[PDB]
């Protein structure tokens, strides 16, 4: 009935402000799945305690691609191109009764730029007829950026990715009856996860591939949903190859309705996980200066602004539950007291989804390293289950994010 809605640099929500309080929890429609692949129970517990701590929004993997790599879910949606798994896609219809219920919404990716769900890589392997080669095991970084980004040039893996979106938007909820275009439990379509143009040597016309990938597949989505908000999924500059104007330019058009950035001032070396007293103070120079460059691209734009994707690693990058989150909870205070003061001064600032959220999740791993059967987590397959992800016991990182959720909140 209600969708959330845009005007001007804020959302809305029956005609009143919408502020975005999540998280980053890729797996939730797996865990809605009805067979050995789900946990129901826990699914709907999860969404009982981040209720509760004021998260009223979902970053989700609406679907993945199989993968013979070790750094990648199993099983997969989509068992080579058009094989869906029904029986895993009754986990997402699942997700958004279980969603709704609660009032919550969630942001639906289709696609991802990285390995962990195959992705844009394991698309050109299927057309190619070669293996996908795991970044995590080959360690070139610069040569696997190229080969995911080779996805927009590829007339084939344009038509099975559009094929797939689809295959989802146009579905029916085989739960509720509910058609997906009529659902305004879903929030937004997004059209990957952190989609890049490539990597540090993308030259000129790959630039204007990749924004003009971004304007047609969203015009696509609006051709099968003129009502439902879409969203890049990018980082912002970052995920522009440090070209700002090529955020501007594929995010000009009307059919992205507002705007995204992540940040990783771990992964983009600004910050030490080895040595965080030494350099959180220039980390943290760099993350506010990232923060004010996409808050002044959105009012140039005049489009909410999201930190949909942004974490930091535990103290001294242990993954063990107990280790203490001082670096990450001091992190997370500044990013929250800098957009609530961005969103008081009528910024463009529109709210955020920590990545990720661990919840009851569990590892026994020693290695802390998903193997096919071990409970789903924030932290993906290709990172440590306890890198990033928040666990229900990380009391002080909750405590915060139930402050500013709440603070948040118009």
């Given at each position: 009935e209600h969708f959330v809605r845009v005007n001007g640099g804020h959302f809305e929500l029956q005609g009143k402000p919408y502020v975005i309080t999540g998280v980053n929890m890729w797996y939730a429609a797996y865990l809605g799945a009805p067979n050995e692949v789900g946990d129901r129970d826990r699914l709907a517990?999860?969404?009982?305690?981040?209720?509760?701590?004021?998260?009223?929004?979902?970053?989700?993997?609406?679907?993945?691609?199989?993968?013979?790599?070790?750094?990648?879910?199993?099983?997969?949606?989509?068992?080579?191109?058009?094989?869906?798994?029904?029986?895993?896609?009754?986990?997402?219809?699942?997700?958004?009764?279980?969603?709704?219920?609660?009032?919550?919404?969630?942001?639906?990716?289709?696609?991802?730029?990285?390995?962990?769900?195959?992705?844009?890589?394991?698309?050109?392997?299927?057309?190619?007829?070669?293996?996908?080669?795991?970044?995590?095991?080959?360690?070139?970084?610069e040569a696997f950026m190229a080969k995911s980004a080779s996805f927009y040039r590829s007339e084939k893996a344009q038509q099975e990715y559009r094929k797939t979106l689809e295959k989802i938007i146009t579905r029916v909820n085989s739960i509720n009856g509910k058609a997906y275009v009529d659902d305004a439990t879903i929030m937004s379509w997004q059209l990957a996860n952190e989609p890049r143009p490539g990597n540090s040597q993308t030259t000129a016309e790959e630039k204007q591939i990749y924004i003009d990938w971004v304007h047609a597949a969203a015009a696509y989505i609006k051709t099968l949903d003129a009502h439902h908000l879409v969203s890049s999924g990018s980082e912002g500059e970052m995920g522009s190859v440090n070209d700002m104007q090529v955020f501007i330019d594929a995010h000009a058009t009307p059919d992205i309705d507002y705007l995204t950035y992540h940040m990783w001032i771990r992964n983009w070396s600004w910050f030490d996980k080895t040595k965080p007293a030494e350099t959180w103070p220039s980390a943290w120079e760099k993350a506010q200066n990232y923060m004010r460059a996409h808050i002044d691209v959105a009012?140039?734009?005049?489009?909410?602004?999201?930190?949909?994707?942004?974490?930091?690693?535990?103290?001294?990058?242990?993954?063990?539950?107990?280790?203490?989150?001082?670096?990450?909870?001091?992190?997370?205070?500044?990013?929250?007291e800098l957009m609530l003061a961005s969103l008081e001064q009528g910024e463009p600032s529109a709210g955020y989804n920590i990545w990720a959220w661990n919840g009851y999740g569990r590892t026994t791993r020693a290695n802390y390293w998903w193997q096919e059967g071990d409970d789903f987590m924030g932290d993906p397959p290709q990172e440590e289950q306890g890198m990033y992800g928040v666990f229900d016991t990380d009391t002080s990182t909750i405590a915060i994010m139930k402050e500013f959720n709440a603070r948040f909140q118009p």
């Open positions: 517990k999860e969404l009982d305690n981040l209720k509760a701590i004021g998260v009223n929004n979902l970053r989700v993997l609406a679907v993945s691609e199989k993968s013979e790599i070790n750094s990648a879910v199993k099983p997969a949606v989509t068992n080579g191109f058009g094989n869906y798994d029904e029986t895993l896609l009754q986990g997402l219809d699942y997700l958004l009764v279980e969603l709704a219920k609660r009032d919550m919404t969630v942001v639906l990716y289709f696609n991802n730029f990285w390995q962990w769900s195959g992705g844009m890589t394991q698309y050109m392997a299927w057309i190619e007829g070669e293996p996908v080669q795991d970044p995590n095991v080959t360690n070139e970084w009012k140039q734009l005049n489009k909410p602004l999201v930190l949909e994707e942004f974490g930091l690693d535990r103290d001294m990058g242990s993954y063990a539950m107990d280790s203490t989150t001082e670096y990450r909870d001091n992190y997370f205070r500044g990013v929250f």
